[PDB]
C-alpha cells in the first residue's frame, strides 16, 4: 500500500525496541535503528554458537547473492557484525520492496547474540553511511519512500507497552496538539538537529543542544555540564564508577527534563529517568554523559515521550506529545 503501520515492542527495561519484519520467507524481530543505514540479520551463515536461540534468515528462491559484496560495521558501544550480501523481498507492515539489500551476518559480537529477541537491525539513517562494499546500498526507507503517500515515517515508542512505526503518514490518534518541525542536518548521515534550550524541572536555560535522534540508542546522552546540573537536583545522586554512570536512591524524587524546539516544549517525565535497578536500593539514571561521542544523542529515554516524524522531503524532524 501507500501507507503502513507496524507494532514495536520494548525488551526488558526498554533497552531496545523490536519490530517483526518478513525477510524472504522468514519473519524476524529487528531493531529499527535511525542511527545506522545497514539492514542486517542473523542467518544460516551465522555460526551456530552465535545464533543459538535466535530466529534467523535462510536465503530462499527469491534471494540473489551480490557477488564480491561485503559489509562490516562497528557501533558506538563497541558492538559489531559483518558478512556478505543478498537481495530479497522485505515486507514491513504491508509495505514491501522486492530488491532490498539484506546483509547476512557471518560474524556477530556478544552484545547481539545474548539478546535472543534481537535478530538483527533495520537501518533508518541516511543511505550515505551504508557500509556495503564495493558499492553502498540503499536503506529500506529510501527504496520505498517514492511509493508512499508521503516520504516520511513516524514513531511512537512507549514505556513497557506496545508502540508503533508509521510509514507514509502521521496518525492523528497517536498524538495531541500539532506537530512542530525543525531543520535536519544530515551531513554526517544522521538525523541531526539542534534544540533551542532545555529545562531541569522549572529551571530553564537558553543554552542550545545539538545532537541526533536515535531510536537505536537506549539513553539520553548529553554534555557533562547538563548531566551534572540535572543530578545536583537529585538528593543522594552520585557517579558510580563500577556501573559507569550516575545512580541515586530508588526513593529519590526525579525532576522532569525538557528540551525546547521552537515554541514547543518536549518533556521527559522524571519517572522515565529511573532507568534500571543496580542493587543496594539504588537506581541507574536515564540521563548520562555523551563523553567521547562528540555530540548529544536523544535516545529512547527521550523519544518514548514523543511522537516523532522523520520527514525526508526537507529533511526535517517533527515532534508532538503522545496521546
Amino acid at each position: 500500500a501507500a501507507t503502513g503501520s507496524v507494532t514495536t515492542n520494548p525488551t526488558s527495561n526498554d533497552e531496545e525496541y523490536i519490530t517483526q519484519v518478513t525477510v524472504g520467507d522468514d519473519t524476524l524481530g529487528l531493531d529499527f535503528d535511525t542511527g545506522s543505514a545497514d539492514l542486517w540479520v542473523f542467518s544460516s551463515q551465522t555460526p551456530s554458537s552465535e545464533r543459538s536461540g535466535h530466529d534467523y534468515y535462510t536465503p530462499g528462491s527469491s534471494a540473489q547473492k551480490i557477488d564480491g559484496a561485503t559489509w562490516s560495521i562497528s557501533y558506538g558501544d563497541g558492538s559489531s557484525a559483518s558478512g556478505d550480501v543478498y537481495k530479497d523481498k522485505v515486507t514491513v507492515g504491508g509495505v514491501s520492496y522486492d530488491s532490498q539489500a539484506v546483509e547476512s551476518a557471518e560474524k556477530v559480537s556478544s552484545e547481539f547474540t545474548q539478546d535472543t529477541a534481537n535478530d538483527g537491525l533495520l537501518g533508518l539513517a541516511f543511505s550515505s553511511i551504508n557500509t556495503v562494499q564495493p558499492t553502498p546500498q540503499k536503506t529500506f526507507f529510501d527504496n520505498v519512500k517514492s511509493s508512499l503517500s508521503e516520504p516520511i515515517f513516524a514513531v511512537a515508542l512507549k514505556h513497557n507497552a506496545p508502540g508503533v512505526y508509521d510509514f507514509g503518514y502521521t496518525d492523528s490518534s497517536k498524538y495531541t496538539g500539532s506537530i512542530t518541525y525543525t531543520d535536519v542536518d544530515n551531513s554526517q548521515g544522521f538525523w541531526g538537529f539542534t534544540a533551542d534550550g532545555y529545562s531541569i524541572g522549572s529551571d530553564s536555560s537558553s543554552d542550545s543542544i545539538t545532537g541526533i535522534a536515535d531510536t537505536g540508542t537506549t539513553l539520553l546522552l548529553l554534555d557533562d555540564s547538563i548531566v551534572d546540573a540535572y543530578y545536583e537536583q537529585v538528593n543522594g545522586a552520585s557517579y558510580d564508577s563500577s556501573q559507569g554512570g550516575y545512580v541515586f536512591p530508588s526513593s529519590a524524587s526525579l525532576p522532569d527534563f525538557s528540551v525546547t524546539i521552537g515554541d514547543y516544549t518536549a518533556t521527559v517525565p522524571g519517572e522515565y529517568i529511573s532507568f534500571a535497578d543496580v542493587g543496594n536500593g539504588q537506581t541507574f539514571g536515564g540521563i548520562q554523559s555523551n563523553s567521547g561521542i562528540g555530540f548529544s544523542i536523544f535516545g529512547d529515554v527521550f523519544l518514548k515521550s514523543q511522537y516523532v516524524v522523520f520527514d525526508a522531503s526537507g529533511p526535517r524532524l517533527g515532534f508532538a506529545a503522545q496521546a
Binding site: 533497552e15 531496545e16 545497514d38 560495521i73 557501533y75 558501544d77 552484545e111 537491525l121 537501518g123
Partner: peptide, 6 residues
C-alpha cells in the same frame, strides 16, 4: 544500554 553507527 546500547548505542547503535559511530
Amino acid at each position: 544500554x546500547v548505542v547503535x553507527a559511530x
